Ligand binder design. Sequence first.
Ligand SMILES: CCCCCCCCCCCCCCCCCC(=O)OC[C@H](COP(=O)([O-])OCC(O)COP(=O)([O-])OC[C@@H](COC(=O)CCCCCCCCCCCCCCCCC)OC(=O)CCCCCCCCCCCCCCCCC)OC(=O)CCCCCCCCCCCCCCCCC
Ligand SMILES: CCCCCCCCCCCCCCCCCC(=O)OC[C@H](COP(=O)([O-])OCC(O)COP(=O)([O-])OC[C@@H](COC(=O)CCCCCCCCCCCCCCCCC)OC(=O)CCCCCCCCCCCCCCCCC)OC(=O)CCCCCCCCCCCCCCCCC
Ligand SMILES: CCCCCCCCCCCCCCCCCC(=O)OC[C@H](COP(=O)([O-])OCC(O)COP(=O)([O-])OC[C@@H](COC(=O)CCCCCCCCCCCCCCCCC)OC(=O)CCCCCCCCCCCCCCCCC)OC(=O)CCCCCCCCCCCCCCCCC
Ligand SMILES: CCCCCCCCCCCCCCCCCC(=O)OC[C@H](COP(=O)([O-])OCC(O)COP(=O)([O-])OC[C@@H](COC(=O)CCCCCCCCCCCCCCCCC)OC(=O)CCCCCCCCCCCCCCCCC)OC(=O)CCCCCCCCCCCCCCCCC
Ligand SMILES: CCCCCCCCCCCCCCCCCC(=O)OC[C@H](COP(=O)([O-])OCC(O)COP(=O)([O-])OC[C@@H](COC(=O)CCCCCCCCCCCCCCCCC)OC(=O)CCCCCCCCCCCCCCCCC)OC(=O)CCCCCCCCCCCCCCCCC
Ligand SMILES: CCCCCCCCCCCCCCCCCC(=O)OC[C@H](COP(=O)([O-])OCC[N+](C)(C)C)OC(=O)CCCCCCCCCCCCCCCCC
Ligand SMILES: CCCCCCCCCCCCCCCCCC(=O)OC[C@H](COP(=O)([O-])OCC[N+](C)(C)C)OC(=O)CCCCCCCCCCCCCCCCC
Lengths: 96, 227, 78, 78, 78, 78, 231, 52, 29, 85, 103, 105, 168
Amino acid sequence: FHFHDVSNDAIKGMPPSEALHKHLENAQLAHRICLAKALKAGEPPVEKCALTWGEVLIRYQAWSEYRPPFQDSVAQAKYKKYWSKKRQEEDDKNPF
Amino acid sequence: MQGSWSVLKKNCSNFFPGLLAFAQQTQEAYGIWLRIYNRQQKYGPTDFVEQSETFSPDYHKRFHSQDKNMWVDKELCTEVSQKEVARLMTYKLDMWRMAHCAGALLATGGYAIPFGLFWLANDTWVPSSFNLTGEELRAWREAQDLYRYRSAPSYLTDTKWHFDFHAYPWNETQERAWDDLFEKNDVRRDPKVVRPAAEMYDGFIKFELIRRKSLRHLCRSMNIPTF
Amino acid sequence: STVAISVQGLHYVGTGLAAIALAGVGLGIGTIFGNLLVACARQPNLTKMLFNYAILGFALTEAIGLFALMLAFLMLFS
Amino acid sequence: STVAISVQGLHYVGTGLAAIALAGVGLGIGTIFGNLLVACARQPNLTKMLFNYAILGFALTEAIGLFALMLAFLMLFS
Amino acid sequence: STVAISVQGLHYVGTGLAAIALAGVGLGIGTIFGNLLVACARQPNLTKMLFNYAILGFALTEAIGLFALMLAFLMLFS
Amino acid sequence: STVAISVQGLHYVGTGLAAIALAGVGLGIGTIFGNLLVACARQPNLTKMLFNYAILGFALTEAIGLFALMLAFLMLFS
Amino acid sequence: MFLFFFCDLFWLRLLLCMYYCVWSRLCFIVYFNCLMLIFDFLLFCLFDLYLFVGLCLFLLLWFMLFNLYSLILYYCITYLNLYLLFCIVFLLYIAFLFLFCFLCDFFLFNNLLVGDSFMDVFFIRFLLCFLECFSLLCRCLSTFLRLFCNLLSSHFLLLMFFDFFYFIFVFFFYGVFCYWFILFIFVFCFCLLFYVFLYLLDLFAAILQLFIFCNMILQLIMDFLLFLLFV
Amino acid sequence: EIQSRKKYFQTLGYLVAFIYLYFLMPKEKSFSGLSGPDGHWIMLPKGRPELF
Amino acid sequence: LEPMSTWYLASWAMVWYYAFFFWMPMVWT
Amino acid sequence: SNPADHFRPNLKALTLYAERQHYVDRWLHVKERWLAPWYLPWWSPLFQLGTWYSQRSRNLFLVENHLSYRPYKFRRNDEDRNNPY
Amino acid sequence: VYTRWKCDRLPVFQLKLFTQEYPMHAAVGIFTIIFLWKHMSHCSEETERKYGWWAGYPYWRDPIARRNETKYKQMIINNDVDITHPKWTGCSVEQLEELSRVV
Amino acid sequence: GELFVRPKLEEIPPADQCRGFFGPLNDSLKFLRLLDIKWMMNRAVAMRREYLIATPTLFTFIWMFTWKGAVIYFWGDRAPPRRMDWNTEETGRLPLGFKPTPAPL
Amino acid sequence: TKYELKMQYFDEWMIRWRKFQTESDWEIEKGRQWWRRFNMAVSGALFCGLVLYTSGTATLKRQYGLPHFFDIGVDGQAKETMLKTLTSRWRYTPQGYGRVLITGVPTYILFVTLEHYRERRRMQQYLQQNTVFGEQMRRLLSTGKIEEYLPVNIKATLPASQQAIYNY
Ligand SMILES: CCCCCCCCCCCCCCCCCC(=O)OC[C@H](COP(=O)([O-])OCC(O)COP(=O)([O-])OC[C@@H](COC(=O)CCCCCCCCCCCCCCCCC)OC(=O)CCCCCCCCCCCCCCCCC)OC(=O)CCCCCCCCCCCCCCCCC
Ligand SMILES: CCCCCCCCCCCCCCCCCC(=O)OC[C@H](COP(=O)([O-])OCC(O)COP(=O)([O-])OC[C@@H](COC(=O)CCCCCCCCCCCCCCCCC)OC(=O)CCCCCCCCCCCCCCCCC)OC(=O)CCCCCCCCCCCCCCCCC
Ligand SMILES: CCCCCCCCCCCCCCCCCC(=O)OC[C@H](COP(=O)([O-])OCC(O)COP(=O)([O-])OC[C@@H](COC(=O)CCCCCCCCCCCCCCCCC)OC(=O)CCCCCCCCCCCCCCCCC)OC(=O)CCCCCCCCCCCCCCCCC
Ligand SMILES: CCCCCCCCCCCCCCCCCC(=O)OC[C@H](COP(=O)([O-])OCC(O)COP(=O)([O-])OC[C@@H](COC(=O)CCCCCCCCCCCCCCCCC)OC(=O)CCCCCCCCCCCCCCCCC)OC(=O)CCCCCCCCCCCCCCCCC
Ligand SMILES: CCCCCCCCCCCCCCCCCC(=O)OC[C@H](COP(=O)([O-])OCC(O)COP(=O)([O-])OC[C@@H](COC(=O)CCCCCCCCCCCCCCCCC)OC(=O)CCCCCCCCCCCCCCCCC)OC(=O)CCCCCCCCCCCCCCCCC
Ligand SMILES: CCCCCCCCCCCCCCCCCC(=O)OC[C@H](COP(=O)([O-])OCC[N+](C)(C)C)OC(=O)CCCCCCCCCCCCCCCCC
Ligand SMILES: CCCCCCCCCCCCCCCCCC(=O)OC[C@H](COP(=O)([O-])OCC[N+](C)(C)C)OC(=O)CCCCCCCCCCCCCCCCC
């Protein structure tokens, strides 16, 4: 197994949907690891895997709420209006 | 007057006969009002018929002007009798209260039933038609008089205090009229002495400038629903 | 070489400089009321009318301070 | 290269700048009372009325100094 | 990169700035007394009521100077 | 990273700023004596009481100057 | 999130119940001008200009029970939050403004267009109207900001001075028995004088700030009142 | 008479409340955990398996 | 500073709203 | 810092937490229970007052098509400016 | 004679005061209350840690974690939730058993 | 301040006397009066109908200070990012082989 | 029938699970918004017409009489035409509560009826949808309960880069 990188530096150049999905996958992986440890120990899962389940729940809630905008006439018009050639050049020039 | 179980039983028993009598009175009063309204529209002054606008000098809010928007039909006896006019007035009061109750019922659906129980337990806001005997009518009139006693002093005090605090009479006769106007009912007031107060207050506040709180008090004192 | 630096405590300096603008507003208000006091003693019968104009100046003078105060928050909280 | 720096001590500088706003406020208040004295000597019959207007002006002028002093506390305690 | 820096001696700078707030306070007090002399000279019988008001104005002006002085000493010991 | 720096020349800068406040004091002195002369000319009979009040104003203004001067010397030797 | 807490007035509520179970006259009011809006006789107003009296009195009582008693050490001003004061002033100011606006008399706003017909309408008068409409809301904001800042600054200063006084009194009183006792005595006398001065200043400033808080609202109301003359 | 009785009872109640608040009621969210509650959740769903 | 905070502003303002809607009538009467 | 800590309420007793979803759902159940009975017709002002504004707001939320990202209202950490997730 | 403040009981006088004396103020207050409970009624765990505790957050016991643990245990037990479902874990039950035997 | 009295019909100057941004919009330019805002403002001032200028402003401020301000702050759409996450229009559709429940009947 | 009580849960669930909102559902909601605006416009037009019809004769003369703000000539012609049309016949011009009822009750009835039937139309539209939202609507109307996490239960379609979770 492998956890995805969701650090601020990595998150900066990532779309929101990808970041949410990666967080959800990491939560699921942690939950399944905790469940596997509990099963190996033989103890009940509810008494050990509650917090991981809650994290998975909150990540699911955050992930299901976001719907990427549809690309249509008005949305494209707004994007082109804001992102003019001058603004693109200024953004490229800026080092931050 | 406070609600009671006896009045509740009285009004529950006479509910449907009262409604039927109210409907009959509604038909009769509609006929009377049709006659009166036709006469007003035909022979009324141009300002009264056209509903001339009278605005206040401070905030320019329209209100009825006593001189222009009120007209006395001197020749109404030919078409309508005095008894018909009294019947129309009584029906107007009863219809106002019934209309407010019906509006509450329509607004709140079936949730007005307990409020209807509170309503039938008191004779203050029930129509006169709900009384089928002399004793019931006497109790109803007693309730109306109690409401009038409850409400009138506030209106009188509002008027007197506002005038006395913001203005004073011009001459001695006006002073006497103003002082004698607000005497208690245990003494007899001479109308000739009191009349100049009308002109003085016209100089202060006409009916077109009456404030909303004073209007609420007056309508309470006239057994007119205010909510 | 291209070097980008981000100094993260500078917004304090900008906020203080904007706050300095309040000295002029405070001084102007004091000037208004000083003229009011020395003007009422000359024409007392019109005291009330002068007071209304004095408040008007305060309303039109305090507003400027808000802009400077507004900038302080926009930089203090950012 | 991208370098981010956070200087802690800058909050002192911004705090001191805001205090300068009190120079105008303190001066403005003195202006009001100076006119008050020069006005009471021109019409002492109104001394009580003038004293009332002076106090009102003092608070309005004082109010502004507090705005600056609030910013000083915000940065001094952050 | 994340870099945290703590400059020690800056508190001296901020303290000095707050001291400047006493410039207007000192000037404001001097203004009051200057106006007091004229008022006394133009109305010599009121040598006490004017004096009391001058003290009141000084007290309020002193208060503003003391508000700033608290920051000046506080930052100097921070 | 945590970096602590101690600049040993910034105890001079704060000292200079505290000296600036003296200007608001020195000018305040001139204002009191600027109006004292006018008062003496207006009412020469009160050359004494006015002088005493002026001395009181000068002392109080100088008191502000010395409060600031204390900060100036403390940061000069520390 | 639901936090359950209590105000710091329970003892004062007990005292109010104890000392006001029987009637008593009131003759001193912090803001008396709410009762006397009209000074020239024969002038009267059809608008409910005396509606603010009850709210004014209650606000004065509440803010006085909090602020004046806050000078006692460890007494808490439970309402001391910027946005809470914003909510209070919003309530009062906007309620009165909507009372004037619900009147549906547009001529009432004619005075917003500042100046006379001589001034250019678009480039001068309209800009002035914009500034005045902005200035109303700015007056609301300034009222609440002033009320917050005065208390905050005064109490910060009091806390700092009290800390300094405690420090010097506790850790340097032994100088009374030493050869430098005169310096300590001078410092102690100065601290006592400063203590008294600060307490007096705070006492006066609280009442004055309440006066101004109520006066701003009354000025809002008065800016739109029109008086008729009795004839 | 009515107000005297009401204010007497109110005074007793306020006295009890003042005593409890300032001498018995612990402050919430203590660092040590020896006094006061740390908070808890409410209105949690119950008997709604389809909700998850 | 809590005075500049908002994480429990609603509960904090409930005190003023209770005073306005429930205690003011009692003080009035 | 320490002086700033003196300006806090001194009589905090209890804190309760609840999710927006849970109590919103409970409120909706209560509203349905009280607006369900037949004796309250759908055309009554009470029913419309109860339902129409909520329906309008929910429709406005659904129709929303924003080019930017609105972080989840109830995240575990909302204090980091450089981490909307 | 009849007066609202002297003759009516406290709830009735309250309703009258806020309906025929200060109705607009009551409306504005209700509006503001709704706004506050709609936009200023949430506090994240990090915010609670930073500012939510009088002396600071006691990380040595992490009461927030215990609170959330109790919350989730209660929810799972009452709602009969199978936390081993593939959606929660992202893998089948057999894969979970294989992982348990591996680790 | 003082009481306001509406002008009489005879006290209202003619429309032709009003001035626009550049000059009067007299005959052959009357239809331009609709588009010239300054001409309308001057006409309103001449007719003593100043409220038409003041009422829309103040109300607007209120509307921004009360309702739209917070709506924009809490629910407004910020500026779009450079790299945009458009929707692939792949989510939502039911999977192959799924048997949807029958509609009400 | 009361469709709002059923539809409120569905709307809340869709907001919570708006990620699975297909373009068809978005178009449905946009159409609902447009129809709400249209209903508002028609109700306002009816209210304005009723107000004008019940307006007093003197009020109409003042409103649609001299002076003319623009004085173009078309304005005066239109005002005179409307004034003559209104003042020619007899009109019932009540005041007070009567005018309130006459002007409002028809408007309220029209607006409410249109909105209710449009809500029914939207319910039918969502019933006819072949998406996860339509399935949720059908299940809600069948069992009477909202089944949350339905999209992940029946494995609703996801982007090609997010199908790993279904990999079981
Ligand atoms: C189903 C949908 C429901 C919708 C929701 C409704 C919600 C409730 C709101 C209230 C609704 C009305 C309730 C019934 C009232 C009774 C009828 C009536 O008008 O009585 C006359 C009476 C008139 O009063 P007035 O002061 O004398 O009138 C002055 C005029 O100058 C008077 O003029 P005049 O001086 O020339 O004299 C004329 C007089 C002369 O006549 C007479 O003298 C004879 C008597 C006639 C009246 C008789 C009334 C009897 C009332 C009692 C009925 C029985 C009740 C039984 C209860 C128990 C049942 C078991 O005749 C009149 O009274 C005529 C008045 C004008 C007609 C008003 C009706 C208009 C609406 C109906 C048409 C709707 C068409 C829809 C089309 C749709 C298209 C898409 O009505 C009232 O007392 C007023 C109502 C009081 C309550 C007000 C509550 C607030 C209202 C706000 C409404 C805002 C708009 C709606 C939206 C609300 C959202 C919040
Ligand atoms: C079958 C029948 C026929 C068919 C139907 C016909 C139609 C019927 C309907 C129409 C009838 C109209 C006439 C009605 C007249 C009677 C009205 C009335 O009530 O008179 C007072 C009536 C007594 O009248 P009365 O003795 O005859 O005296 C009359 C006098 O003339 C005194 O007169 P007054 O004038 O002095 O009294 C007036 C007083 C009337 O008020 C009262 O008297 C207050 C009554 C309540 C007092 C409650 C005190 C007790 C509290 C207890 C608390 C709980 C204790 C603990 C319980 C523990 C339980 C385990 O004040 C008012 O008028 C205020 C009006 C306020 C209006 C509010 C408007 C709000 C609008 C919102 C703002 C909107 C702004 C626009 C926004 C736009 C946004 C787009 O009061 C009572 O009988 C009290 C009843 C108390 C019941 C028990 C306590 C409440 C129980 C609640 C249970 C809840 C269960 C569900 C819980 C679920 C939880 C989840
Ligand atoms: C789960 C754990 C438990 C908690 C559950 C909570 C559930 C919450 C649900 C969700 C709510 C979400 C929203 C919350 C927002 C909160 C906002 C907030 O707090 O803002 C601050 C704000 C602070 O306002 P304030 O300025 O401090 O003034 C309010 C004060 O109450 C003072 O104002 P005032 O003085 O103007 O008030 C009028 C006062 C007028 O003055 C008085 O009446 C004086 C007395 C004052 C009492 C009230 C003060 C309480 C003081 C602290 C506690 C006292 C000791 C308690 C001992 C507990 C021991 C464990 O009269 C009263 O208080 C009337 C009640 C009197 C009761 C008397 C009972 C006598 C019983 C005698 C029995 C005898 C039996 C003999 C048998 C013999 C057999 C042989 O709070 C409020 O405005 C009220 C917030 C309430 C929101 C509603 C909460 C729901 C109801 C919960 C009831 C729980 C009952 C069960 C508890 C059982 C024990 C554990
Ligand atoms: C009396 C009171 C006095 C005291 C005031 C006191 C307060 C101070 C005053 C200021 C207010 C303070 C604020 C306090 C809070 C109040 C609540 C609040 O602000 O909520 C706003 C809040 C804002 O919404 P939101 O929640 O932020 O959501 C934003 C979304 O847009 C929501 O989306 P949605 O789905 O809800 O739809 C909303 C829709 C609302 O609009 C609609 O739904 C559609 C339109 C409705 C029309 C209503 C009827 C109007 C009259 C019809 C015709 C009558 C005459 C018929 C006869 C004709 C004969 C020829 O708006 C839009 O989305 C904009 C669409 C615009 C389309 C433009 C298309 C281009 C062509 C048309 C324009 C350009 C024409 C150029 C011509 C050039 C010629 C040379 O609610 C709304 O504004 C929308 C819902 C309420 C709509 C009510 C509609 C009626 C309004 C009154 C009209 C009549 C009175 C005004 C004129 C008076 C003259 C004397
Ligand atoms: C659960 C239900 C919820 C309901 C919600 C809806 C609201 C409440 C409903 C009703 C509640 C009951 C009480 C209402 C107030 C009663 C007032 C009263 O006593 O009037 C007596 C009065 C009778 O006395 P009168 O002596 O016969 O005549 C009055 C005198 O003329 C008086 O003489 P005067 O000297 O006073 O003359 C002045 C008078 C002259 O006016 C009148 O009296 C004439 C009647 C009113 C005319 C109004 C229309 C004006 C022209 C509009 C043009 C719009 C063009 C737009 C084009 C857009 C194109 C794209 O007043 C004015 O000048 C005021 C003009 C209005 C200014 C409006 C300013 C709004 C600013 C908006 C700010 C921004 C908003 C947010 C942003 C929005 C945009 C994004 O009644 C009337 O005149 C009409 C009353 C109408 C009542 C309202 C009917 C409500 C119908 C509701 C239908 C929709 C329901 C939706 C439900 C949704 C689901 C739940
Ligand atoms: C209208 C104007 C009113 C002016 C009132 C003037 C009051 C003058 C008081 C003189 C000094 C009183 C000393 C009290 C000492 C108490 C014991 C003690 O240790 O206290 C130390 C405390 C604090 O002293 P400290 O700060 O030295 O405490 C040191 C403690 N350590 C070291 C632990 C920090 O004294 C005070 O705080 C007293 C301040 C009083 C300020 C004036 C408050 C006026 C407003 C409240 C009026 C209440 C009236 C209520 C009537 C009923 C209403 C219905
Ligand atoms: C650390 C960060 C610090 C940030 C600090 C920021 C400042 C915070 C200041 C808080 C304290 C001060 C608050 C002052 C009050 C602010 C008021 C405000 O802006 O609230 C607006 C908000 C706006 O509400 P909203 O945010 O829900 O807006 C919904 C808009 N959509 C759906 C598009 C998202 O008002 C409310 O929250 C109350 C709404 C309910 C009450 C009103 C209902 C009637 C509405 C009428 C019009 C629409 C319906 C049609 C007509 C009626 C039909 C029946």
